[PDB]
Every structure is written in C-alpha cells, then in structure tokens.
Design a protein around this ligand. Structure first.
Ligand SMILES: [Zn+2]
Ligand SMILES: [Zn+2]
Lengths: 97, 120, 209, 189, 244, 192, 314, 117
DNA sequence: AGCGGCCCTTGTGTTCAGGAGCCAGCAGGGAGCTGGG
RNA sequence: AGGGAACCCACU
DNA sequence: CCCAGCTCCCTGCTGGCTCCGAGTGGGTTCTGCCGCT
C-alpha cells in the first residue's frame, strides 16, 4: 500500500479527503470506553487484523462477484482501504491507541 | 499569415533569380587536380563551386603561416610543415560545406596561427 | 546538420520500437534499449552522405499472437510522400504478403496520398506518421494515463456487466494521438487506468469513433 | 453631455488593426447643420516594402494615398508637398519615413488626374471624368477639414493643415511625441 | 453603460478640480455619470475675431504670406483649432496675451491659451464646453492677492466690491485642463515659503482651497479625508436620498 | 546617474519600479507590524481582528499606520498630465508622494493629493465590481445549462439526459461531497 | 516576472476552449546537467527563444560598390582585399550593390551566436545565388557584406534586407516569443524524488517559462524533459497528447484558477465538469456551440440559446 | 554614414532616385518624370539604425528652459557660459528603454546649452 | 371624410450595443491524371 | 371588467 | 514519354450572426395626421 500511495501521490502531500475520520473515531472510542493508556490492553492483534479484513469486505461501492465488479470495487475504495489498514494497525492499536 | 507572406517573398525571389539566371547553366567542368597535388581528396566535389586551384592556394597560405610560425618558434623539422598544412586543408574541407565558409575558415586558421606565432 | 539528423533518426527508431512493442509485436530488449552509439555502430553516421539511408532503416516486426501477422515501418526519403511511393509500398507489401505498414514522413503527405491510404483500408491497413510526432513517446508523458486495448470478449463482458450500449460509452477519436499510437480503428474500445485523488485508482472506457 | 473636442488632431495607436498609427481630426465649422466631418491620416502597419500613409476622407469609401490628396489640392512638385509636410529639411529620418508615400504616388502627377482618382473612389462615381473631378473638388472644398475653410481659394490653408496632420502622425510614429489620451479632459467638451 | 471597459470609467488625473472624485453612481453607470466640483465653471464660448485682429496687429505672420522655410524655427499659432499663422517670440507673445486676459482688454476670461514649449505651438481656445476653474496667480513666489483685496471683499455689501473685481484686477484666473497642463500649482501658500530644499520655486498659480475639488453631495461629509474613498462615494449617493 | 542595471527578464524602468515598490511595501509592512505591536489587550480593533469577527491586520495598519500605496491597474498612479500625476508636482517626479504613496493613516487624515489618489484607487474597485457581476453571471448560466441534466442513476453511474455514461461512479469513488473530511495518510511520507 | 492570466478571464478562457489564450505559456523542465548549472540552461533557452536577424543587427546600409577590390570603407576595403586574393570567382557574375550589415557584439555574445552561423543560415534560406562574406570575431566590429550574383538590383537588395531582418530565423522556435529561466522557490515545480532511504526530497532545478506554445517541438528538443514538460494551452494539449491528457490538464488549470486565492472546491465537481467537457472524444466548449451540438433535444437546446433557429432546424 | 537625405530635381523639383551608369559604372541620382541627372557623392543610398542610438540632445530645444514645470538644479553648472542653474528632465520618448537618464539645459536665456552627465 | 405615404433634410450621408468567437463562401494554389505531340 | 411600449432614476 | 490543361481537394482570408447577471421600487411620455380623392 505504501508503494501504491507513493505512485499515486508523486509529490509529498499526504493530505487527502476521505469519508470517515478514523483518528477522531478512535478518540471517541477511547473516551467512551474509558481506555487507560497506562495499562496493557486485552485486544488480540490477530483480532485487529481479522476485524479490519471483515470491515474492508463490508464496505462495497461496486457490488458484484464477477471480475469486473471485483476490480471496480477494489479501485473505488483503494485509498480508503489503505488509510484504514495503515490506521487500524495491530502495532498502532497496541502501542498508540 | 506570416508563412503566407514568407512564401509571397519566396515566389518573388525565385522569379527574380530566374530573371537574373541564364537559360542554360554554363557548367564549367570541374578541373581535375594535377597528380602533383598535395591536397587530400583533391578529386572530391563535396563543396559546390570550389576549384582545386583554390584549395592549392589555401594550402599555400597555410604553408606560409606554418613557415612564419616555425621561424618565430624555430621549429626543427620541415616535412612536418607540409604534412600539417595538408592536414589542415583536408580538415577545413571536411568541416565546411560552402566555398565562402571554407575560405573564411581557412583565413580564421591563418589568423590563429599568426597570433600563436606572435605570442611565441 | 549531420549529427542532428542521426540523433533524430535514432529517436524515431526508438519511438517506433516502443510503439511496436506496445502494440503486441515481438521486439527484442536490445532494440528497445539501444543507445545512440549502438545506432551509429549498426547503421551509418553520415545520413546526408547516404550512410545511413532512409531505405536502410526499414524495420519489419511480427505479432506475438501469430507470426503470419507482420507490420512494416517505411521511412520514405522524399520530404513529401506522393501517390507513386504509396503505390510502390503497396506493391512491396503485396509481394511480401504483409497486411500492415507504418509510414514515417518528414514534411507531410499529399491529400491524394491520404485518400489513397483511406481507400484500401479493408485490404492493406497502412498508417501515416510525421517524424516530428515520433521524436517522442507521448504515452510516457505524465498527463497521458495508461491505455489498453480491450478484446471483443472483454468489451462484451463490459457491456453485459453495465447493461450499456456502445454509443453510451465515452468516445475517443480515431485520430487521437494515443489512438494513432495504438493503431485502434473505429468500433474498438480502449480501457484507461488512471490514478485518482479520491478513489486511488479509476478505470474508464472509451469507444473509438 | 460629454463629447470629444473638435478641430484638434489626435494620434492614437491601434496595433490590433491594419494601421500602426492613426491620426484623426473632427473638423466642424463654427455653425452648421452638417455634423462634424472626421478625417483620418493613418500609417499602414508593416506586414509591401515601406510604410505608406493613407488618408480617409469623408464621402470617400476607399483610403487614398496622402500625396494624391496633396496633389488634388494643387501641389504637384514633391518639394512643395514635403515643404507642407516636413518643416525641417535637415532631418533625414522624416524624409526616409515619407519616401514610401511619394513612391506610392508617382503615376498621378497632375491635379486633374488626382481629382479623377479621388472621384473614382467616390460613393457614386460618374462615367464622365469631368463630373468625377467636380465631385472630388467639391468634396475637398466643403467636406475635407471644414473648420479650416469652406469657400474657394482656401487650398493653401487646407494643404498646410493636412501637412500638419501628416507631420503629427510622423512624429508619433518616430516616437518624438507621445500619443494622445482619449480620457484626458481638454480633449473633451 | 453596456461597454465593460474600465478605462472610460476610471477617475482620470485631469478630473482634479473640475469633476468630483467621490460622487458617482455605484451601479451600471459608475464613472460614466459625473458631477462638477464646487468651483468648476463650463465656458459658454465667444467669437475669436478680436483675438485674430490683435494677433494680426501683433508681430504674427499670416499662413499665406510666410514661406515654408520659416516654419521650422517658428511657433505655430492655433485659434479654435485653426492654424492661423506663425510667430517668432512665443514667450513675449504669451506674456502679452496673458496680460490682456488678466486686464480683460481684448480677451475675455474664458479664453484659454496654452503654449507647448517642447513643441512650438500656441493654442488659443474661445470655444464652449471647456471646463475650467479659478486659481490664484503667483508672480515671484508671492500671491497677487493681498490684504487690501480681502479688506475690500469683507465690505462687499456696501462698497460693491465683488468677485468680478478680483477677476478684473488680475488676482484670479480661470484655468482649464489644457492650460492646467502648463501651470505649476501650489496647494497652499505655504508651498511658496522658503525651504531647506525648495521643491519647485517657480510656482505660477495657487489653489484657493484644496477642498473645492469636491461636489455638492461630497461637500457635506465631515472629515472625508479620514474615510475610505468608497464610503465617500456611497455617502454622496445617499445624501440625495435623505429626507429633509 | 545611469548607475542602475536592469535585472534579468526586466527593463530599466521595470527594475526601477520593482525596487521602489519593494522599498515602499517593506516600509508599509514594518509600520503595520509596529502598529500591531503597539496595541493593548483592551484594544477593540484587536479584539475584533483576533476573534475573526470583522477586520484584518491591514485595516489596523491603515487606521494607525500609513495607508500605503494607491495603484491603478496594478501600477503606481499614472502620469495623467504631461509627465505629471497632478499639476502640483514637477515633471518626471517618480518619488513616493508624486506617484501616489499615502504616508498618512486614516486617523491622521490624507492630504489633498493623497485624497485624490485614494479616490482613484477606490474607483478601480468599484468598476471591477460593476463589470465582474455581468461577466460571472453569464459564465454561471452557461455552466448550468451545460451540466443541468447530469445525475446519479440507480446503477450508481453518473449519466446525462441522453443516458450516456459521464462517470462510472460519482467522483470516481461514489461518495457524496458533504460527508468527506480532510485526513492524513500515515504511510506516505515516513522513511523506510 | 511573466504576466499570467487568472481569475474570471482565465476561467472564461478555459470553459470556452479558446484557441487564442491571452497568455499561453510552456513550463519546460530540463533533464541532465542542464537542470543543475545555469550555463547549459541558458544554452537551452537560446535554443528555444526565437531569434531573428533583426534582434542582433546594429545597423544596415546599402552602398554602391563599383569595384570590390576598392571599397568605400577603409577597414572594409582592407579586409575585403585580404579576402579577394584571386579571381576565384566569376567577375561577370557580381553585382556592384553592397548590403553592409553591422551586428551587435553584446546580443551575439548573449545568444552565443557567430558570423559563421548567420552566414550558414543566410546561405540555407537564400541559396548560393547570393554571396555573403564575414570578417573575424576578433575584429573591432561585426560586419557582413552581402551581394547578389548575376528589375533593378537596388530595390531587390532593399527587399532582401527588409525580409532578412524579420522572417529569417537564427535560433529558437518560431512561436516562442520569450523564454524566462528561473529556479522555482515552491515544491510544486521542484523535482520530487524518493531518496535511497525512502524519504521524499525536493531538488531545485532550473525551469523555463515561455511566452508562446510550440509544445511538440519543445518536447522533441534534446535535454528537455518530455515527461513533465507541459502547457497551459489546452487546445495544444489536446492536439499533441490527446483527450485524456487534455482532461487531466483541464482539471489542473481549473484547480489552479480556483485555488490561486486559497479557496477549496471539492474535487468531484471539477472532475464532473471536465468529464462533461471531454466525454465525447473532443473538447466540448461550455458555450452555445459546444452545448447545442450534442444529441440532447430541441427543447433542451432552445432553452439555452438560439431558440428560434434550433426549433426551425428541428 | 548616418541617414541619407533626399535630392530634388533641378528642373521639376521632384525626388531624384539612384541609378547606375552601365558603361562608366558610377552612381547617379536621376529624376523619373524628367530627363535630369546629377552626380552622387556619398555613394550610400540607404541606412537603417536598428539600435536607434539617436543623440537625444539633437531633439532638445533651449525653449524648454522657460518651462515652469521642469525641475531646476543649481549643482550642475553649464560648461559653455558657467551658469549655475539648469533645468533637468528625462528622455520621455519611445525607442529608449534605458530612459531614466537626465538631460540638462542651461537656464540662461541666450546660452541654451544642452548636455548630459 | 380616410388612404397614400413617410420627413430622414447631404434624393449622395456616420456610426441605429460594439466587439469577440464560430460558421460559410470565394479565390488561389498544388497533386495528380490524361489527350495531344 | 385591467393594457402595452420606450426611456430615466434608484435599491440589494 | 513529356507538356500542358483540367479536375478535385485543401488554405486562407473575409464577411455575417449571436451573446453579453439576478431580483425590486418609483417616475414621465406616447400610442399620426393632412391632400383631395
Ligand atoms: Zn526633373
Ligand atoms: Zn549657459
């Protein structure tokens, strides 16, 4: 995804326009559930990766199981999926959020 | 627009040249160089309207320039004088493609050699 | 005037090789990655003197799908290409059982010659290129996105998937620089992949008209 | 109501046109139902050989070379016309600038021929040369520069003022005088 | 109003004193409809016959009598756009004409006389529609207006000393734009005072008051020089809509 | 004294004008910054500027510091008269006052020539408004009539009245514009 | 430096698909050493900007010279007799009318031109029928003597001069009137690369800004980047690169116009406008001509413009 | 060399054009509508000053010393008569890009000397 | 009583929103082909 | 049951 | 076996047509008449 992004944005501008404010959603989740950053968390990182995969499968812009619809769906949400994967990392979920 | 006016000039110029040009081009047959010609590629006709005798004269001027350079710097060998002059003439012919430009280049080389001799 | 012409010929040959490779013809890697020194070695270095001669640059390539399909790329010497040279090229193609050819002219081509090219389309598909156009590869410009030619099966799949009619797709002119580069005629559909700041990637289809 | 001042020579430049520089004078008599007669003296933009000065007169639908106009007024010799146009004979730049106009007008060497030429350009040229000359003379007497004079025997004053207009055009073309401003008050009444 | 060019609608430099800079409609007719300044006067016109008679009586040489060789070093003289002759001493001719106009012996106050020094033309205008304004005369860095003139003006109700007496005693002068191009105005008499580095020191006229450049509607604004100019234009537009 | 040499891409007059404009703009900026520094926390100009309710720092500078330079068509006040901006100056005066530099604040008040030059400056903007209105209005109508019938269809494509495909997905991603937000990609800039 | 049209005028130039923009320009990026050092950048600039003979000439003068052996100028006579050593030519085929052209040393050194190149261009444009002779550069003045080899010859030489000054090109491309050269101060024009450490870096490199548009010739030039070199004229982009290239370039120009003031408009609106303008394979101008040529319908068209004409055709 | 003037015929006062005597090969100035000829001396028949290096002092007239709107300086005395005051102005003429140069004219009524520094 | 007929004053006569982009028609130029020598 | 055309001024 | 017209296409200019922001509030003047059929 990093290589794909560097190809898409040849310059060094990382400001993009995307639907969901993932950082603010994580902040809201931290405030709602009283997350203590100073204690170990009970979130299995494999849980994080599996959840991200299922979520990515749940966000469809071009529906259809044929190869054309599959490729169009992958293209439509490519940038948002890259953002989601790089934000909902197992490592970031463990040591940052 | 500009190109149209340009070709306007072109048609005027060509008809004026024809008015100033003879009906038949009186082609003066190229003079074959004498076997004693020290000019490389003396039989070439690459440069139009250039005579072998003109090349011989240019090589003679190069010879005089080299002689002046030698007497100023006291060059030892003499055969080198002739070889260098012939090489210079052949190089000038190879580079230039028009008689007037050829003559100008030869004169420029002569001036360069003269200045070098003056420097010592 | 002598090295400049050799450089121009090398650039034209490199662009033609890239075009042929992009069209699906079998071109070796050395031909694509040929330097100016290699061009001066294989060919001449005094184009005005006649070495190399434009007749010496003629290149024949063969399609990967079937070796029978071959394409010429002729380099006429005359600045303006008339009917007689087109007739000579057509005679050579008929003798050699070739169907496609590319003509890279220097200054241009007569209107009658263009009409002749158009007339015999169903028999001999031969195209026309200005060497000023082939001095660079337009497909490498940052503005030009990735163009691909869709096979009839792929176009049928596309129309079935989107329930479209060919006249409902966006259009690309047959005289478009990229259309000429890929040699796509009317009725063919071209797929265009381009980056997108909103979606990441985007594929759009254009019908050649 | 604002209008542009009359009887004053204005030189404006319009490079998006056929004329590089264009003089202008809205000559109007002291009192007359006839509106102001506008005369132009314009220098052709480069692009034959030199730059030719033409004169656009009222009731003539084709621009005529200035030297033809000066000959129609009764000044045939080049010396007299240049005396009326170029006041300093030791300034060769103006002479070089005016040479093309003299070259343009060489076949027409007499007043009657010039009048016939001017009449031929008229709106309604007559098949008879006499009536064409009559029309041209009438136009020059009454329509060209009314403010200078409308009666007869005013040819010298007309020639002097037209030469002054040509001189102003030449000065503007040579860069010796700034072009007039259309928004400048004082050029307005 | 259809034309969208901004040049005719712009406030030209020459409108100074003649036309109000502020008052103008802000709609489609912005800059095309203007208003006179307070002291601006538009001339009504007069016959050039007395001026031509004086010039002929003067050293001026007719256009017909002269020879073309004499025009190179001579000064062309125009009267209402008619080249009437040439002269040899433009400076003293202009001095005489200015003296006559100030005395009003033969030239009325409305006549505007412009000498183009770089060129060699003297243009005399007696036409109508020439907007002008009155300016004080300065001779040698001193106003011609004195304390006695003000003393007489203070009693105009009794001694019948009006503005026409100022204009007739050569203390004030009507200047139009063409002639205003050739004058050297002092905004205030302070500019005539000696300075460590004199700016001009050759002033020819002085402003009666710089605030006379405004019109009827922009003349009621208090402290209009402390406001942004569009505000002054808007008030000029709104002073006509006030109820009184 | 012919001791000034033109800069690349410019002529001598352009270079001189650039130097003068640079000097005067720097002076205006410095005086404006000094004006900002002088203000107290109780100042109401600063109160309305800091909150963003109304006004800017340029307004404060003009009210307290110099008003600045008045330009007509992007250049200093032109020589409307013969080599003079007004009949109160000498011929060929390129100084700050002559060409329309206002050194007085609005509180101090403008001098007559400054008042006239500022009036010219304001007239420029008034005309600009009066003309831009119609030009932009025609442009807007033309755009609307060009694109009025394009809409999102039930197959999610964007098509015009003729039912021809304009976009296969709206915005190439098929999302409405009112719900997207600015965000930052965290994997683009970082080094390996 | 160079005036660039922006705002509503540029927007009108864009959506109208004007063929004659007020200020067309190119943005030429250089490839190799030309990008780093300014000398080779200046070389390329001179190779681009048009240069007619009138831009380097000091003054021309048409003399009458009966015998070239003895000319009317002492220095010219000396140099000519140095040149005229033999009857290497045909004496009969010579005209006595000389055209002496004095060039400008400053301009020639600025363009790195020489008498040899000018003589070459004169010969190419006029052929061998003329005769041009030039002195050495080390001389005090740059002088060229032109004659016609054998309507009068006088006016003929005058016309030859009046043409040579203007139409003849010594360097550059015809339609490029001026070419500025500068180092960009903003990362939008700087060369962005990804270092060996995988981090973005912005190299500063010389770029050229032309005043005309000859995009094809400029792109084909050596030492000119053909990947990043672009134009602000969209008709030229369409003619040279194509419909997708002009789509992207039109979007770029619209974004520049809109965001020059710092304002933001969502990308999808610009994308939709550009798609509508380029969906049919040609530049559909946002005008009566562009819009009413579509296959929309007479009632659709009549509401826009040309009501009665549209309905009469229908 | 400089710009070439124009000569007028002695019998008709019309412009004389350059021509060549074929047999003698000498430049003549011959009238076109008459049969008059004159001997040319300069031998230069045309001049074009592309640089336009015109000495603008030739375009200045001492009359400008009477202009009240021109600035006057006492630090640039005139060399001819030693007067201390002079009016200074600029080129203000087209065909001069480097037109910030100052030209001085003596204020003395009779001197009228024009110079440049 | 109502139709002829319109006055544009120069029947010959100044600008009836004027200028900017598209489209259409005319004349010129040249490529190529074909009937005579 | 009832109008219109033209022009001018002005407001946002 | 070339020469010189003639046909057919393409170029360039020149001439003509259409368009020129959205609403709103006031006001005044004018929408025939004159000769003799
Ligand atoms: Zn004679
Ligand atoms: Zn003196």
């Amino acid at each position: 995804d990093r290589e794909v992004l560097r190809v898409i944005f040849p310059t060094g501008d990382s400001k993009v326009v995307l639907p969901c404010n993932l950082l603010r959603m994580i902040w809201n989740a931290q405030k709602i559930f009283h997350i203590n950053p100073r204690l170990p968390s009970d979130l299995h990182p494999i849980k994080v990766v599996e959840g991200v995969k299922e979520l990515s499968k749940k966000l469809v812009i071009v529906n259809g199981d044929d190869p054309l619809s599959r490729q169009a769906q992958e293209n439509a949400t490519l940038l948002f999926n890259i953002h989601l994967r790089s934000t909902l990392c197992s490592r970031r979920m463990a040591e940052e959020f | 627009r500009d190109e149209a006016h340009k070709r306007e000039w072109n048609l005027f110029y060509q008809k004026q040249m024809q008015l100033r040009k003879g009906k038949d081009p009186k082609i003066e047959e190229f003079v074959p160089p004498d076997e004693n010609c020290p000019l490389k590629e003396a039989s070439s006709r690459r440069i139009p309207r250039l005579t072998v005798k003109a090349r011989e004269h240019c090589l003679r001027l190069l010879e005089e320039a080299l002689s002046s350079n030698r007497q100023s710097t006291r060059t030892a060998d003499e055969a080198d004088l002739r070889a260098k002059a012939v090489e210079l003439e052949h190089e000038t012919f190879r580079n230039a493609k028009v008689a007037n430009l050829y003559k100008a280049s030869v004169l420029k080389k002569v001036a360069d050699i003269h200045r070098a001799s003056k420097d010592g | 005037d002598d090295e400049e012409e050799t450089y121009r010929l090398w650039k034209i040959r490199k662009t033609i090789m890239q075009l042929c490779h992009d069209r699906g013809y079998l071109v070796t890697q050395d031909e694509l990655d040929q330097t100016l020194e290699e061009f001066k070695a294989q060919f001449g270095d005094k184009p005005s003197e006649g070495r190399p001669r434009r007749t010496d640059l003629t290149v024949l390539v063969a399609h990967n799908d079937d070796p029978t399909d071959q394409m010429f790329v002729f380099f006429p010497e005359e600045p303006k290409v008339g009917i007689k040279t087109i007739k000579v090229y057509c005679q050579r193609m008929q003798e050699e059982n070739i169907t496609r050819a590319l003509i890279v002219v220097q200054q241009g081509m007569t209107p009658s010659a263009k009409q002749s090219l158009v007339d015999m389309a169903p028999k001999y598909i031969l195209e026309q290129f200005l060497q000023q156009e082939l001095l660079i590869n337009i497909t490498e410009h940052e503005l030009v996105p990735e163009h691909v030619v869709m096979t009839k099966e792929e176009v049928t799949e596309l129309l079935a998937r989107y329930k479209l009619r060919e006249n409902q797709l966006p259009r690309i002119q047959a005289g478009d620089p990229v259309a000429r580069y890929f040699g796509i005629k009317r009725g063919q559909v071209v797929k265009i992949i381009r980056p997108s700041e909103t979606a990441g990637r985007y594929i759009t289809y254009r019908l050649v008209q | 109501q604002e209008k542009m001042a009359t009887n004053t020579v204005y030189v404006f430049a319009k490079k998006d046109s056929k004329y590089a520089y264009t003089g202008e004078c809205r000559s109007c008599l002291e009192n007359s139902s006839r509106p102001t007669s506008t005369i132009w003296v314009s220098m052709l933009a480069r692009g034959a050989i030199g730059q030719r000065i033409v004169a656009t007169l009222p009731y003539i639908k084709q621009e005529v070379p200035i030297i033809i106009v000066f000959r129609a007024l009764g000044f045939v010799s080049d010396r007299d016309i240049l005396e009326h146009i170029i006041y300093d004979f030791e300034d060769p730049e103006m002479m070089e600038m005016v040479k093309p106009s003299l070259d343009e007008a060489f076949v027409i060497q007499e007043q009657n021929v010039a009048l016939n030429f001017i009449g031929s350009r008229g709106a309604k040229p007559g098949v008879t040369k006499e009536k064409r000359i009559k029309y041209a003379k009438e136009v020059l007497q009454k329509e060209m520069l009314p403010h200078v004079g409308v009666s007869d025997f005013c040819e010298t004053k007309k020639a002097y003022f037209l030469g002054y207009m040509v001189h102003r055009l030449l000065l503007a073309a040579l860069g010796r005088r700034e072009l007039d401003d259309r928004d400048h008050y004082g050029n307005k009444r | 109003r259809d034309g969208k060019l901004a040049k005719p609608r712009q406030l030209h430099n020459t409108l100074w004193g003649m036309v109000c800079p502020a008052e103008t409609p802000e709609g489609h007719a912005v800059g095309l409809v203007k208003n006179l300044a307070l002291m601006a006067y538009i001339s009504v016109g007069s016959q050039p016959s007395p001026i031509l008679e004086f010039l002929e009586e003067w050293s001026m040489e007719n256009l017909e009598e002269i020879s073309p060789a004499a025009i190179a070093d001579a000064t062309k003289i125009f009267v209402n756009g008619c080249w009437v002759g040439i002269h040899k001493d433009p400076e003293q001719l202009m001095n005489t004409l200015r003296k006559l106009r100030r005395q009003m012996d033969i030239i009325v106050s409305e006549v505007s006389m412009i000498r183009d020094i770089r060129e060699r033309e003297i243009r005399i205008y007696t036409d109508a529609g020439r907007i002008c304004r009155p300016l004080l005369i300065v001779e040698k860095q001193k106003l011609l207006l004195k304390k006695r003139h003000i003393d007489q003006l203070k009693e105009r109700e009794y001694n019948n000393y009006s503005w026409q007496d100022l204009v007739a005693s050569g203390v004030v002068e009507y200047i139009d734009t063409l002639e205003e191009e050739t004058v050297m105005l002092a905004m205030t008499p302070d500019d005539l005072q000696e300075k460590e580095v004199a700016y001009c020191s050759t002033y020819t006229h002085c402003e009666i008051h710089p605030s006379m450049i405004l019109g009827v509607c922009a003349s009621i604004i208090p402290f209009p020089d402390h406001n942004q100019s569009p505000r002054n234009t808007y008030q000029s537009a709104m002073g006509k809509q006030a109820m009184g | 004294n012919n001791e000034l040499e033109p800069t690349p891409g410019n002529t001598l007059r352009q270079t001189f004008e650039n130097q003068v404009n640079r000097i005067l703009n720097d002076a205006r900026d410095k005086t404006g910054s000094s004006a900002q520094k002088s203000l107290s926390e109780y100042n109401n100009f600063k109160s309305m500027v800091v909150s963003g309710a109304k006004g800017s720092k340029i307004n404060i500078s003009q009210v307290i510091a110099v008003v600045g330079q008045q330009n007509v068509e992007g250049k200093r006040i032109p020589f409307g008269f013969k080599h003079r901006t007004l009949p109160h100056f000498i011929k060929d005066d390129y100084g700050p006052e002559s060409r329309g530099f206002v050194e007085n604040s609005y509180l101090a008040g403008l001098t007559p020539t400054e008042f006239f030059f500022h009036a010219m400056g304001g007239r420029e903007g008034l005309i600009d408004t009066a003309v831009k209105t119609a030009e932009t209005g025609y442009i807007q109508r033309r755009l609307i009539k060009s694109m009025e019938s394009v809409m999102v269809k039930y197959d999610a494509t964007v098509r015009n009245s003729i039912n021809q495909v304009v976009q296969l997905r709206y915005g190439e991603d098929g999302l409405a514009g009112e719900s997207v937000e600015f965000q930052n990609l965290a994997t683009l800039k970082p080094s390996n | 430096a160079k005036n660039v049209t922006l705002g509503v005028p540029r927007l009108k130039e864009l959506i109208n698909i004007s063929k004659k923009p007020k200020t067309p320009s190119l943005t030429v990026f250089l490839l190799g050493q030309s990008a780093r050092d300014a000398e080779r950048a200046k070389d390329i600039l001179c190779r681009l900007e048009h240069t007619t003979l009138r831009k380097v000439t000091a003054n021309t003068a048409i003399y009458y010279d009966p015998n070239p052996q003895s000319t009317v100028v002492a220095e010219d006579q000396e140099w000519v007799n140095v040149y005229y050593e033999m009857p290497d030519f045909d004496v009969a085929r010579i005209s006595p009318w000389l055209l002496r052209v004095e060039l400008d040393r400053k301009h020639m050194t600025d363009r790195k031109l020489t008498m040899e190149q000018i003589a070459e261009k004169i010969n190419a444009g006029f052929g061998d029928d003329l005769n041009c002779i030039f002195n050495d550069d080390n001389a005090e003045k740059l002088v060229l003597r032109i004659r016609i080899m054998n309507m009068d010859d006088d006016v003929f030489l005058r016309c030859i001069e009046s043409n040579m000054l203007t139409d003849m090109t010594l360097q550059g491309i015809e339609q490029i009137s001026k070419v500025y050269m500068h180092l960009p101060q903003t990362d939008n024009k700087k060369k962005i690369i990804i270092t060996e450490d995988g981090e973005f870096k912005a190299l500063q490199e010389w770029i050229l800004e032309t005043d005309g548009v000859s995009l094809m010739r400029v792109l084909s030039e050596k030492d000119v980047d053909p990947v990043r070199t672009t134009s602000n004229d969209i008709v030229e982009i369409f003619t040279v690169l194509g419909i997708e290239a002009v789509r992207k370039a039109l979007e770029r120009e619209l974004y520049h116009v809109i965001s020059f003031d710092g304002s933001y408009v969502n990308y999808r609106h610009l994308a939709l406008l550009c798609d509508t303008m380029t969906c049919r394979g040609h530049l559909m101008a946002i005008t009566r001509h562009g819009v009413n040529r579509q296959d929309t319908g007479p009632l659709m068209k009549c509401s826009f413009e040309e009501t009665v004409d549209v309905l009469m055709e229908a | 060399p400089g710009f070439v003037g124009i000569r007028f015929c002695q019998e008709c006062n019309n412009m004389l054009y350059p021509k060549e005597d074929k047999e003698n090969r000498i430049l003549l100035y011959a009238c076109r509508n008459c049969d008059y000829q004159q001997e040319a001396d300069n031998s230069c028949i045309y001049v074009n000053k592309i640089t336009h290096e015109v000495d603008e002092l030739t375009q200045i007239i001492a009359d400008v010393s009477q202009d009240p709107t021109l600035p006057r300086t006492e630090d640039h005395p005139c060399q001819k008569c030693g007067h201390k005051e002079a009016v200074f102005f600029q080129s203000h003429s087209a065909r001069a890009e480097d037109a910030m140069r100052l030209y001085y004219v003596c204020t003395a009524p009779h001197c009228g000397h024009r110079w440049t520094e």
